[PDB]
Design a binder for this molecule. Structure first.
Ligand SMILES: Nc1nc2c(ncn2[C@@H]2O[C@H](COP(=O)(O)OP(=O)(O)O)[C@@H](O)[C@H]2O)c(=O)[nH]1
Ligand SMILES: Nc1nc2c(ncn2[C@@H]2O[C@H](COP(=O)(O)OP(=O)(O)O)[C@@H](O)[C@H]2O)c(=O)[nH]1
Ligand SMILES: [Cl-]
Ligand SMILES: [Cl-]
Lengths: 306, 306
């Protein structure tokens, strides 16, 4: 069963791949146990692809970029999978590309878990580059950052001195920043904004930094700057491997994800408790109104979940 | 008992204040229950001071700044308390200043809880400005940000084009940024770095923002720029009150702190569990070595805590 399924994936049996993917997406406890045995078997193949995260707000040009980058990597001999943690016509028909929409959300955590595990199945099937994308609602960027080696952030220049749609905790996550839509009359403004952002990075990150994120400009549509974006991603990996830090980071990602599953399980028992859900609104109001102190309110919530 | 103690604090009895402060710092369950009843009684006085956070790395000039700002506010008729969540000779002898070192740490959470509650006792005693400081080890800045209205970040210019000691998730927390030590031969470099940081803020924060953080220069030692730092803090409050957003934010801080106490209690049961503490190292190793998947490792940890 489990071990035969692994070998079929290793052989390139696409049907075994899809079976296994449905197997890791499954909510049943027989499938869950099966999924983990599978992932153990496939441990030698785990890690064998480059992991690249790609984020940006809607309208930045993320689909177009991922499509153009996917084709450019396929032209270079890679096999590319694209996963969403939350269309591309050219890529969906290519035999050496794999495209899965984001899985129905048990939670962000459920989707993430499914994506992480599907990454291993795809590495086993021979995909050597995995692009993981997110639009960045809520905790989404932080989640993708924790499963990739290099996190690429796509932005737009509003003008030559302003960027748009930079969310609260996002630049810090970026290993590469791309000012996209640098074509036509707008090319001018995009390059000046990119330079200005380089200035900000030089100002703020210690000169001593092992890696400081490059700012690049690109036209996803025209394909200019795409080769350079890819060289910068490979450069990042090299600098990290060269520091003996590439594998160290992946091992830390795995441990951190272990603990976040422990945290989600323990916190869910409280947050989804029907009695907590019933009183929580009234508890929060009573804190807002000063009728209850926060410590008393916290004790009331813990009690409700007792 | 409880209600008489409140009135003494309200009257300005310093002995009742210290009693109550030891009462909120106490680990016993009779004192804890007493503390919360006290805080309920004092609910009309809660909130009556300005809450100002002040962070920066060691060597920035934070003690000197807090001392100079404290005196400047006392000269203006305020009564000032300074609390640490983790020396000032002039301030420690003034009758209208209050200085408490950081409380011995049950945890960052314990220290924070104690500081938050002591803020209420101080507001009751007539202190109308509370400065809350931290050096920024670990989760410290985020903790202070969650208990103040305006968070002031102190930095140093390494040169005229580089800042120093900017930690991972900190600029985002700042409502005001100060480039300190802008005196002598170095004044030149400090002002150019401040301008450059203003450029970065204009580049990155939407022009539409209700508040975008000002960058100021200061000499804590000479006292130049201190009045201006204080005007900018008052300006922040005004902009927030004017948007009808000042009280809304405080109410959100209280609710968020309620939940973080619930989270700490629930997570501590697992993390401090002796069986979890016994296996955790070996579990993490087995994940690192690929002998265990993360999901299996998480299940092993949850089981150990069963
Ligand atoms: N001018 C220009 N437009 C682009 C570029 N890339 C994408 N677009 C356009 O921007 C719009 C959104 O593109 P899409 O890839 O769907 O962005 P997404 O929402 O981030 O996925 C589409 O109309 C694209 O044609 C580019 O490099 N230059
Ligand atoms: N040149 C200059 N030195 C300062 C200034 N403020 C503080 N210092 C010096 O910087 C050192 C550290 O000051 P301190 O307030 O203890 O910094 P802290 O570690 O952040 O508390 C001391 O030697 C101060 O005299 C300033 O405005 N200008
Ligand atoms: Cl509690
Ligand atoms: Cl689990």
């Amino acid at each position: 069963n489990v071990h035969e399924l692994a070998q079929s994936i290793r052989d390139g049996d696409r049907s075994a791949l899809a079976r296994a993917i449905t197997l890791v997406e499954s909510t049943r406890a027989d499938h869950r146990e099966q999924a983990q045995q599978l992932l153990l078997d496939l441990m030698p193949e785990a890690g064998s692809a480059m992991h690249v995260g790609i984020t940006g707000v809607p309208g930045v040009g993320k689909s177009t970029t991922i499509e153009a980058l996917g084709m450019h990597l396929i032209e270079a001999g890679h096999r590319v999978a694209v996963l969403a943690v939350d269309r591309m016509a050219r890529l969906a028909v290519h035999p050496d590309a794999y495209i899965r929409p984001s899985p129905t959300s048990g939670t962000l955590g459920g989707v993430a878990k499914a994506t992480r595990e599907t990454i291993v199945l795809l590495e086993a099937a021979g995909y050597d580059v995995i692009l993981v994308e997110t639009v960045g609602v809520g905790q989404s960027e932080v989640t993708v950052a924790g499963m990739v080696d290099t996190f690429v952030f796509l932005t737009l220049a509003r003008t030559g001195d302003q960027l748009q749609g930079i969310k609260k905790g996002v630049l810090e996550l970026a290993d590469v920043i791309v000012v996209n839509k640098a074509d036509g009359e707008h090319a001018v403004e995009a390059k000046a904004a990119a330079r200005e952002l380089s200035g900000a990075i030089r100002l703020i990150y210690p000169r001593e930094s092992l890696w400081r994120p490059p700012v690049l400009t690109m036209s996803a549509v025209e394909g200019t700057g795409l080769p350079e974006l890819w060289e910068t991603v490979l450069r990042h990996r090299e600098v990290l491997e060269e520091a003996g830090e590439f594998e160290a980071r992946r091992r830390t990602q795995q441990v951190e994800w272990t603990w976040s599953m422990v945290r989600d399980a323990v916190l869910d028992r409280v947050m989804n408790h029907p009695e907590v859900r019933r009183i929580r609104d009234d508890v929060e109001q009573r804190v807002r109104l000063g009728e209850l102190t926060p410590a008393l309110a916290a004790q009331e919530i813990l009690d409700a979940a007792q």
